[PDB]
Amino acid sequence: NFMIYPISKDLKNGNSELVRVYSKSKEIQYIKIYTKKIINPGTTEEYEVDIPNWDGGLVVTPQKVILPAGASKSIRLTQFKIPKKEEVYRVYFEAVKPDSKTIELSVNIIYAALIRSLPSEQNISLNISRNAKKNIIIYNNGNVRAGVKDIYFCKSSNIDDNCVKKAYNKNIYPEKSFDTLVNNNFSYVFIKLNHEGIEKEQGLIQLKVPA
Amino acid sequence: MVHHHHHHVIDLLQADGNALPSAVKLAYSPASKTFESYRVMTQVHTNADAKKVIVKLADTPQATDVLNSTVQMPISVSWGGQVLSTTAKEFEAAALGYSASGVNGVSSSQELVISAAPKTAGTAPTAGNYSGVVSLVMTLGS
Ligand code: NI
Numbered sequence: 389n390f391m392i393y394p395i396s397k398d399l400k401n402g403n404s405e406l407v408r409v410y411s412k413s414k415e416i417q418y419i420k421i422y423t424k425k426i427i428n429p430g431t432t433e434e435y436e437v438d439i440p441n442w443d444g445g446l447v448v449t450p451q452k453v454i455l456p457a458g459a460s461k462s463i464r465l466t467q468f469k470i471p472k473k474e475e476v477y478r479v480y481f482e483a484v485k486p487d488s489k490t491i492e493l494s495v496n497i498i499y500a501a502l503i504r505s506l507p508s509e510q511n512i513s514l515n516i517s518r519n520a521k522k523n524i525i526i527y528n529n530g531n532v533r534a535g536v537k538d539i540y541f542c543k544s545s546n547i548d549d550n551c552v553k554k555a556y557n558k559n560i561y562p563e564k565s566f567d568t569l570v571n572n573n574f575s576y577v578f579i580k581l582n583h584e585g586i587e588k589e590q591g592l593i594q595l596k597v598p599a
Numbered sequence: 600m601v602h603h604h605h606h607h608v609i610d611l612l613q614a615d616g617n618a619l620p621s622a623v624k625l626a627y628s629p630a631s632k633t634f635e636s637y638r639v640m641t642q643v644h645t646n647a648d649a650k651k652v653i654v655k656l657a658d659t660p661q662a663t664d665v666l667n668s669t670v671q672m673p674i675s676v677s678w679g680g681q682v683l684s685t686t687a688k689e690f691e692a693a694a695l696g697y698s699a700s701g702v703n704g705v706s707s708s709q710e711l712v713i714s715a716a717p718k719t720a721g722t723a724p725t726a727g728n729y730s731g732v733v734s735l736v737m738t739l740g741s
């Protein structure tokens with residue numbers, strides 16, 4: 389029984405970050421930590437798979453902690469290599485029972501942290517495309533995921549309030565493509581991405597290709 | 600104030616504000632051919648933008664019996680009105696919910712219904728130990 393902070397992390401330039409683990413328990417716990425890599429993320433083809441600790445892109449020190457009652461610990465996470473493009477991982481935190489100080493079906497809650505292994509120069513580049521069935525397709529040409537908040541299928545070239553604001557809220561990861569589920573005859577499209585602090589807002593528009 | 604870089608947390612608690620337990624036993628009773636449900640309401644403690652929390656479990660849980668693994672009796676686990684599959688279930692905040700606290704992450708007040716099941720419907724029960732575990736996994740999505 390414990391809690392971790394935080395549950396999502398970005399890692400750039402080879403610098404480590406820490407995930408902290410806090411016990412809510414009166415009994416001493418034993419915690420093991422393991423990393424899975426996320427393949428074809430953002431897609432319907434997204435799955436997880438176990439990787440090793442130093443050659444898979446993530447360095448996790450340590451992977452086993454004795455966590456005394458009410459104690460807290462730090463786990464270090466750093467990238468092995470700096471990738472050419474964004475890779476994404478999940479780091480699991482699990483109470484292992486050597487012992488943790490009808491029947492019993494003990495409940496083991498597990499937390500996993502989403503880790504973004506980021507490239508040196510974050511570059512965002514989007515492509516436009518038309519499907520078979522001529523749905524409109526967005527492709528990620530950049531080395532970093534593209535968080536799409538809202539897409540503007542403008543009738544005109546410019547953003548009149550007649551255009552159809554369709555919300556997608558989806559991350560399009562590099563080398564991958566995304567279906568707008570729109571085949572209609574829009575002239576130009578406008579895409580809105582996410583920001584809060586520091587990382588620099590931009591806005592972008594891409595011409596439709598005909599059906 | 601000054602960042603305070605990271606902004607995402609998850610902590611699952613009872614809606615009491617109290618902790619979940621390690622082990623749980625359903626009372627074993629016929630009740631006109633039924634098995635009672637270990638309901639527990641929940642809190643989910645998270646910072647704003649929490650809402651994209653996903654929940655999938657490590658493996659399909661089993662009543663586990665070494666000496667006899669012969670027969671297994673199903674277990675169905677409901678959260679937010681949805682069953683819980685080894686397949687990740689995208690959730691929205693599911694707090695109901697939305698409030699703001701610059702000092703606090705505001706709760707998500709509803710019930711987890713672990714409702715153990717039978718292999719065939721309307722079923723006469725077998726006899727045995729049925730030990731076991733249920734791993735539960737909280738994360739965010741890509
Ligand atoms: Ni700093």
Ligand code: NI
Pocket residue numbers: 606607648
């Ligand atoms: Ni965020």
